[PDB]
Amino acid sequence: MNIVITGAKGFVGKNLKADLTSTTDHHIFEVHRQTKEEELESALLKADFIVHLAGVGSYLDHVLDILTRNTKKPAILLSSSISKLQGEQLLREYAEEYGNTVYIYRWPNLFGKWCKPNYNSVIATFCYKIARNEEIQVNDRNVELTLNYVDDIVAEIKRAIEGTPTIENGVPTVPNVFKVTLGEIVDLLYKFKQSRLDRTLPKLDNLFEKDLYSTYLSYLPSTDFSYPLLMNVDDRGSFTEFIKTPDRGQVSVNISKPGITKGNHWHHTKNEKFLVVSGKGVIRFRHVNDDEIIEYYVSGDKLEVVDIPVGYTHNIENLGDTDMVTIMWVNEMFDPNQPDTYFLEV
Amino acid sequence: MNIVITGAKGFVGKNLKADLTSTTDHHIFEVHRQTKEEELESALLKADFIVHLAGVGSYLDHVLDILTRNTKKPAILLSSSIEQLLREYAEEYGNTVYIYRWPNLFGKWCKPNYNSVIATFCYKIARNEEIQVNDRNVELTLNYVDDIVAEIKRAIEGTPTIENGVPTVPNVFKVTLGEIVDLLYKFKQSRLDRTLPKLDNLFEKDLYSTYLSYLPSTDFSYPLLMNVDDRGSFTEFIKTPDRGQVSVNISKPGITKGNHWHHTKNEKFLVVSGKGVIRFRHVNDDEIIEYYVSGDKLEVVDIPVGYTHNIENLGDTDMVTIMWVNEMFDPNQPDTYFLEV
Ligand SMILES: C=C(C)c1ccccc(=O)c1O
Ligand SMILES: C=C(C)c1ccccc(=O)c1O
Ligand SMILES: [Zn+2]
Ligand SMILES: [Zn+2]
């Protein structure tokens, strides 16, 4: 199928173009302000489907006029919004005079990667500014925004292309509409930034937050994709926290130099998992009231997880000639009021 | 203080004993069935606080009778469940008596195939043994041993938890057998699917730690699946529906991996052993951005959407990278496109 995308260099166009050329065999005719009038016409008259992303307005009228001479009666997709609605009745009359299926959508504000900041998306501007430690302006935190993520826009458009749009009360409607306050948005973005300092992760079964997180990351300066962890270092090795959550535990990285033993503690309720990913050694266990010592000989050649059960004192020792690197998951963030850690030599 | 724990070899006793000797300077007098009558009496008459764990009955009456001759009028703590007489004792001899009404209890060090159905389920389930559930809808009322211990320590210091004028251990749980069993089978099945329990659910958190204490000594570890080839390996470690997934990538010397991008999926790389480079290119651009990283200096590299990226080992040894991804792999939305940086 020959698919024309007008406004193809825009936020949505670029997203759609990349997707269609990645996931279909359709011939994409990009139209934009560098297109010559000849190639606009040529493309329109060959078209099977027209995805119109530029405004309603004189440009569209011109595109529509050319399409009256396209003998295949290609379907046309556009959005009438800008919160005002323009041109709708005229476009229904066009569809009915010339036959073309015309899908009029009423897209709300949009967000996602590749949207130009300091232009006409407030979320692009907040992401851009916040990632660059630039001051933002929030007149009122309680303003509600109605939003669609670009992936859903793209997917709804693809569904229309293959003849199965999403209809609601007799109107094409992209799903996964989000209704959120500015204050909730801004708070999430500042949270994403602060997480490089506190190691926390977003809540990724919240669809809006998930979408916004990926969006925010696309605005990072090229020089800013990495960030330092805090390596607590001494002549025994190091210990470095990587990620913390309130509900799925915390992962850290322990490193022990040759000949080094660490640990010799137990808890009542706190528990861990060790996974040795480089080097070799031994994890030892003893029941607080017993003398039986249980040893697990482990190494990065064979990845196995060792649960650290409660009520056992345990230590970990490097038995090789290189650094021994262990990933260490713990069931809960450290709480100064309930450290739940007791020193006892295995 | 001199603190007597009757029934000290029991489930609660052993828990309490280990805690008190770990977090206080108090002199603990364990009494139990190996205590001689002389040592019972001696200990009781010296006592400042009596934590009675053997429950009500002729044994307790005998303990109470001895304590009428303890000049210091020590406080006494017990649980009446399985009363008026004990209120009358307190009022005749002066001693502060805390009557609790503990429901069923669970936690580590409880003897299985005995008096605790949760101990039995943990024990059995960890050993791949058949369990009996007559009715899944039976509701159990429960306290975790840590809360029992803590409430007792609070009473020792003179500040118990009172409700409707009765000592009550908090964090009472009300749960069906079916919910308990389903969580335990889940904990086991997680060794196969890499998932983690929901640890801001207090009961599930407590139960998870409890379950782990029942693992056979030979069963503390479990294999991960190392997808291995001549380039290295890739091994999933942990998966969650809400905080992403962590895996371990290993590349041999000279090896490049990746050269893909996503729309919405994203990752974090953390090189913990060896050294190399993580590369990035915007899908519509030619600018290649490179991050030179190694295990000598732990830094996280976010993998942002809309950039194709690869990772290459530039050293002598295996290059070990921990890789967090924002979502479990979904066959209907793999959201991964091959593109050479
Ligand atoms: C709980 C931590 C941070 C830790 C760290 C290093 C080595 C052995 C341990 O058992 C351990 O618990
Ligand atoms: C998403 C995974 C599993 C992965 C694994 C190895 C190397 C490089 C990658 O970019 C990567 O995405
Ligand atoms: Zn530990
Ligand atoms: Zn990747």
Residue numbers in the entry:
A (entry chain B): 1 to 57, 71 to 95, 106 to 369
B (entry chain A): 1 to 57, 71 to 95, 111 to 369
Task: Provide passages from the article that reported this PDB entry.
In S. aureus, the enzymes CapE, CapF and CapG catalyze the sequential transformation of UDP-D-GlcNAc in the CP precursor UDP-L-FucNAc via the intermediate compound UDP-N-acetyl-L-talosamine (UDP-L-TalNAc). Structurally, CapF is a homo-dimer displaying a characteristic dumb-bell shaped architecture composed of two domains, each one catalyzing separate enzymatic reactions. The C-terminal cupin domain of CapF catalyzes the epimerization of the compound produced by the upstream enzyme CapE, whereas the N-terminal SDR domain catalyzes the reduction of the compound afforded by the cupin domain, requiring one equivalent of NADPH. CapF is a metalloenzyme containing a Zn2+ ion in the cupin domain crucial for catalyzing the first chemical reaction, and also important for the stability of the enzyme.
A construct lacking the loop 57-70 at the N-terminal SDR domain (CapFΔ57-70) was employed for the structural characterization of the enzyme-inhibitor complex. To avoid this severe complication, we employed the truncated construct CapFΔ57-70 and successfully obtained the structure of the enzyme-inhibitor complex. The crystal structure of the complex of CapF with inhibitor was determined at 2.4 Å resolution. The asymmetric unit contained a dimer of CapF bound to two molecules of inhibitor (i.e. the stoichiometry was 1:1). The molecule of 3-isopropenyl-tropolone is bound deep inside the active site of the cupin domain of CapF near the Zn2+ ion. The carbonyl and hydroxyl groups of the tropolone ring are found within the coordination sphere of Zn2+ at distances of 2.2 Å and 1.9 Å, respectively. The seven-membered ring of 3-isopropenyl-tropolone makes extensive van der Waals contacts with residues Phe262, Lys285, Gly286, His288, Phe297, Ile339 and Met351 of the cupin domain. No contacts with residues of the SDR domain are observed. Superposition of the coordinates of bound and unbound CapF revealed a shift in the position of Zn2+ by approximately 1.4 Å towards the tropolone ligand, resulting in the disruption of the coordination bond between Zn2+ and the residue His290. Taken together, the interaction between 3-isopropenyl-tropolone and CapF seems specific because of the combination of strong coordination bonds to the metal and the high shape complementarity with residues of the binding pocket of the cupin domain.
